[PDB]
Amino acid sequence: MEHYISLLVKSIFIENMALSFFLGMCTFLAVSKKVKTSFGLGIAVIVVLTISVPVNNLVYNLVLKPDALVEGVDLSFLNFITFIGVIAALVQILEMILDRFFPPLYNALGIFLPLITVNCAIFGGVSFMVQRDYSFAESVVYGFGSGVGWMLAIVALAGIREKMKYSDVPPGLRGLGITFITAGLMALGFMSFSGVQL
């Protein structure tokens, strides 16, 4: 369908929030050393942001939308509460299930879950969903697109920092500064799709 593919490509390439909204950088610039290390984190972000968007959208359209529970009353001033609470509960439960029911997958996904239990890149996604007021069928697609775009961005940065093993960075900038400059140049590259419509 035009809408349910346009929204996906939109979230994937035009507003990559790793590099167009610039969220989640505290881990973007921290866990980026090996491609086969950042791939697992990308997968974990994909699953967390594909799960936490639909449930939050359901609860928002059910009990925190104004007049949705009782006419003339609203509960706008606890949306942050419920978003962060459901995010933390889902992360904890998923980590416990990963360690219990399917142990071999813990090495690939379960280890990374305690890091992203709270994060800008996920909270901002939830807030943007609630701000743009999506329906469920498009909200799930938006969440999946956001996750996959974040995974793509972090994997590309891991590849760049792997290739840069031949560099001769000056001693002062060694590490953190060169990572920041690389991310800035990455933004300069990704400014290509600033104006396209979808």
Partner: protein, 387 residues
């Protein structure tokens, strides 16, 4: 001074261990050979700039007011006395002279300030002055609008050297194209000086649109140039008589230069093949789809191949081995990706008229990911124990 003998002479050293014979090709030869490959394009671009300037200016002004104008900016103030006249039938002696008077200050400032940065950093780290600066200086000076003031170019090259290449550790150590980063700096920080309709023609007080941008607002019959009033045809844009930048015209006069290096093995032909196949495939797809809106949907591949800034970028910017992928099968992916982007962001992105400068910076980021994928496949093969 007498110190230039270091870069004139060969050092005259001998090997010490391992292979005691060495191939005679080297970095100092490669850079200079690229430096000598653009000339059949640079001279034509200078001539074209002079011609467009003369045609537009004499189409606009005449008489005593024209005398005042030619007694205005130092371009005309100098070329009127140095052996030429500003009339409508002027030939080489005025056209090329005006083009050179426009181009030389930009180059002489870019080269000086970039060389200052390079010598400062090289003296701080105490290595020999690298030879990868001439190519970047030429390839940046060749891709700016003629009316661009000197200090904006100085800031652009300063950014493109210090922020993109020099900090990462010099030639061969960086990961993104220095000259294209330098042009992106201007393209994003001063849009009213590098893009538009008032900077593409050297004539003072004249308005002339980018050749490509006219199709974005009208059909194939809207490619009209107001220099004297004619129609821009495919053969016209292929010979390179359209308005445009100082060096990105005359696709033929640039292909003649680029074929030399491509045949010589300096530039990989795999990337060129991949970019061409991607561009033709995606443009044919768009043409088949079609739509009454966004008039650019109908331009075919043979029209895309010559318009605007495609040929020069494809032949020189893409083939940069440091930025490009390394694996033999990854070069194809790099080429196809850049070929898709240079049409996608020019067809379905109305905000920007020119695309290659963005597409190269986009694909440089994904250059090593293809390398990693191919390497992982090869390692899987080896662990399967078949070589």
């Amino acid at each position: 001074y007498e110190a230039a003998a270091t870069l004139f002479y060969t050092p005259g050293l001998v090997t010490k261990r391992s292979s005691h014979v060495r191939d005679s090709v080297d970095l100092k030869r490669i850079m200079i050979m690229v430096w000598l490959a653009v000339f059949p394009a640079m001279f034509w671009g200078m001539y074209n700039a002079g011609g467009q300037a003369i045609a537009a200016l004499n189409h606009l002004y005449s008489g005593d007011q024209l005398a005042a104008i030619v007694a205005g900016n130092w371009h005309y103030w100098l070329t009127e006395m140095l052996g030429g006249t500003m009339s409508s039938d002027a030939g080489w002696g005025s056209k090329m002279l005006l083009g050179a008077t426009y181009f030389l200050p930009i180059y002489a400032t870019v080269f000086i300030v970039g060389g200052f940065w390079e010598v400062l950093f090289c003296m701080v780290r105490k290595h020999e002055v690298n030879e990868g600066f001439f190519v970047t200086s030429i390839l940046f000076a060749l891709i700016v609008p003629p009316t661009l003031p000197l200090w904006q170019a100085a800031l652009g090259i300063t950014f493109g050297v210090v922020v993109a290449k020099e900090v990462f550790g010099g030639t061969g150590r960086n990961f993104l194209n220095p000259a294209l980063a330098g042009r992106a700096f201007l393209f994003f920080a001063y849009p009213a000086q590098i893009s538009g309709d008032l900077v593409w023609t050297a004539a003072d007080g004249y308005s002339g649109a980018y050749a490509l941008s006219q199709w974005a607002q009208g059909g194939a019959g809207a490619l009209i140039n107001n220099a004297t009033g004619q129609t821009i045809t495919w053969m016209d844009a292929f010979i390179g008589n359209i308005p445009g930048s100082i060096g990105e015209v005359s696709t033929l006069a640039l292909m003649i230069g680029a074929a030399f290096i491509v045949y010589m093995g300096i530039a990989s032909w795999r990337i060129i093949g991949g970019v061409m196949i991607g561009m033709i495939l995606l443009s044919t797809l768009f043409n088949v789809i079609g739509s009454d809106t966004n008039a650019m949907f109908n331009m075919p591949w043979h029209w895309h191949l010559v318009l605007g800034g495609f040929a020069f970028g494809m032949f020189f910017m893409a083939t940069d081995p440091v930025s490009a992928s390394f694996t033999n099968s990854g070069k194809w992916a790099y080429g196809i990706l850049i070929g898709v982007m240079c049409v996608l962001i020019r067809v379905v992105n109305p905000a920007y008229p020119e695309g290659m400068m963005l597409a190269i910076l986009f694909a440089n980021l994904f250059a090593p990911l293809f390398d990693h994928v191919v390497v992982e496949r090869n390692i899987k093969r080896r662990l399967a124990r078949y070589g």
